[PDB]
């Protein structure tokens, strides 16, 4: 009987969503003599697979009620994996696990795309002995003493497949834990793994990027004032090549993705519109495409600073940059300028009687070098009043050194508590992200999708695996069973 | 080892009655004044200051500069390519010159007016300002955050594995 | 019998160094009694000098097997002192 009302659907305000069904809300409630007796019944024997109006069996509504409170996820991992196994001692021959609901998500899938990281990392490391062993995803391969090498489970994770836990997590997700589902194991050391194939395709791109921008920079340095001339035209057309090259790279990227980590190809798609407009308007005649080539010029060596991501952890430095210009400093030169254009008009106004600073934008210039420690603190004589100037001077002086150093004060306060292991998450996840748009190849040319792990029986269901050595000097029980005798090692 | 070889190289440039071994005997005697900062190791504690510019002239300056310099070419480059025009920064040397002095806080920041475009070189002048003015602090921000915690501890066993060397 | 294998050698990758020969295994891995087993017995007895290919005896493995984990190092101090121990009872005229 489903209860597909106001008050039981997901929404802000007052709301409980336990997926409408007795079944599930036995299972959120923490009932489980309930959920014993409903799912095992001679009477009315209730089916665990089955869904809801929005296509959400229990499991996604033990996913979607998790927080990331210790409290609650403790109930969230007992109840999932106390209904996995009641699962599988009524419905063995169905795969409970892999059921879609409407917008086409499974559970792993479903903690991934909603940010609930705390079911996320214990349905990815889950181990079980004993009877139920196939429903496991952490197996145990050889050990030998204290190294044991330990095979994770790549279904519906690796990115060969057309919809992953890594491209969900890099674009669909909307959520502040983005960076922390990337840190855990394996997806630590599934990505480390793809990074060290794609880093030589990474460095050529940046050496094929450095090339035109250094042909980009002969040809606006050594630009005629408005075999050298064919060689001149041989590089405007080959500008011209690739910035409409890179415009129809940045479109595709747009179109197939259709914020923060979203900036430099938004510099891209800029600097290559930029760059065409240039190009059309020198073809067109017109004496202002000289602003605007070297505009992209400059916007282009700005642009350059996204290639620092893949030369180890100089990310870890840039990163915070990125944070910084979001941090306060848009909304920081606004201060000054509500200071700036004010005062500037006081100084207008207060010098245009005679017994300097003539219009509004010297005005404005003459207040902006107090800040660059150049502007001038004279004593006029000219103006008639020379003390209500210097007065007005000064106390601009003193709210600037003011306002500064209340900026520099409230930045170190905001950055005294952020530890590497956030930057460092953000980094991972930046590189997650450029490995996942490596992956995709080209669009004039579409790579090959290449597996990862190998494909290995256990115990005959054939599942593909990913092998993760680790030493452990505690684990001295020699108790867990090993699929393998044989270490046979990579 | 510089040192000595710069020295030698000047001695023996002099005995050649070569014109140029006064550029070097001069950056001999300020590479040895720049050495004499070696031997404050034996002056107690004063170590445990000087091993921290060792850490932070191998911390991020040698890239930093680098980036510094990634901008500053590339800027020097824009301003020349719009400073020949007419309706100030001559060549790149003078256009790179004129651009370092906003970090010692000297540079100029006038209103041209025989330049042609006029609005478009105070803009990229003021983009290159708080471009400058955000990557100084951001600089400052990550060399305070790797130092705030640095102990004390450390610090004094780098100087007593120097003191032991 | 020497263990001169390629997965019990000391290098980067797949490896567990333990100085490949069989009272070193069970000094390195917590077997105390399997180590006073070898140590003594009347049909074969292990002396603790031996050496293997690269010439070094039980007490080199066990320092090259130390982390600088709290939990590691209590396990290499104790089986060394062990060690050490046991080789005063059964060789004190060697060093």
Not at 127 to 144: M, N
Not at 166 to 192: D, G, T, Y
Not at 244 to 262: N, P, T
Not at 401 to 408: A, C, G, K, Q
Request: hydrophobic letters at 45%; charged letters at 20%.
């Amino acid at each position: 009987l489903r209860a597909c009302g106001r008050f039981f659907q997901k929404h802000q305000g007052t709301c409980f969503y336990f997926g409408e069904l007795p079944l599930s809300l036995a299972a959120c409630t923490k009932q489980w003599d309930v959920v014993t007796y409903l799912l095992e019944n001679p009477h009315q024997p209730a089916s665990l697979e089955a869904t809801d109006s929005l296509g959400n069996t229990v499991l996604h509504a033990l996913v979607m009620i998790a927080d990331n409170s210790p409290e609650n996820s403790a109930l969230v991992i007992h109840m999932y994996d106390g209904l996995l196994q009641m699962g599988a001692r009524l419905c063995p021959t169905v795969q409970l696990e892999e059921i879609s609901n409407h917008q086409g998500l499974t559970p792993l899938k479903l903690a991934a795309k909603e940010g609930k990281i705390e079911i996320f990392r214990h349905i990815l490391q889950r181990e079980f002995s004993g009877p139920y062993q196939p429903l496991s995803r952490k197996f145990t391969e050889w050990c030998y003493g204290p190294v044991r090498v330990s095979l994770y489970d790549l279904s519906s994770v690796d990115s060969w497949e057309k919809n992953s836990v890594l491209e969900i997590i890099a674009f669909h997700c909307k959520s502040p834990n983005r960076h922390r589902m990337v840190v855990l194991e394996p997806l630590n050391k599934l990505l480390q793994e793809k990074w060290d194939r794609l880093v030589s395709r990474f460095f050529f791109n940046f050496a094929c990027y450095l090339v035109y921008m250094f042909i980009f920079t002969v040809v606006a340095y050594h630009q005629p004032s408005l075999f050298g001339e064919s060689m001149l035209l041989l590089g405007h057309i080959l500008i011209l090549l690739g910035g409409i090259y890179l415009l129809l790279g940045q479109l595709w990227y747009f179109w197939r993705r259709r914020f923060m980590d979203s900036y430099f190809e938004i510099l891209f798609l800029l600097q290559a519109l930029l760059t065409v407009l240039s190009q059309v308007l020198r073809f067109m005649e017109t004496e202002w495409y000289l602003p605007l080539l070297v505009l992209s010029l400059v916007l282009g060596w700005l642009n350059l600073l996204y290639y620092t991501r893949g030369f180890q952890h100089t990310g870890i430095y840039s990163v915070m940059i990125q944070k910084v210009i979001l941090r306060d400093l848009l909304r920081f030169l606004l201060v000054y300028l509500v200071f700036l254009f004010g005062f500037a008009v006081a100084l207008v106004s207060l010098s245009r009687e005679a017994r300097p600073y003539r219009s509004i934008l010297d005005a404005s210039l003459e207040l902006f070098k107090f800040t660059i420690g150049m502007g001038e603190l004279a004593f006029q004589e000219q103006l008639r009043f020379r003390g209500v100037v210097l007065l007005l001077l000064l106390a601009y002086v003193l709210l600037t050194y003011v306002l500064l150093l209340n900026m520099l004060i409230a930045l170190m306060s905001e950055t005294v508590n952020h530890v590497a292991d956030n930057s460092w998450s953000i980094w991972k996840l930046q590189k997650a992200i450029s490995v996942l748009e490596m992956e995709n190849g080209y669009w004039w040319c579409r790579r090959k999708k290449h597996r990862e792990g190998r494909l290995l029986k256990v115990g005959p269901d054939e599942r593909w695996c990913f092998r993760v050595e680790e030493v452990n000097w505690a684990a001295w029980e020699k108790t867990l069973p090993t699929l393998s005798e044989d270490p046979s090692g990579p």
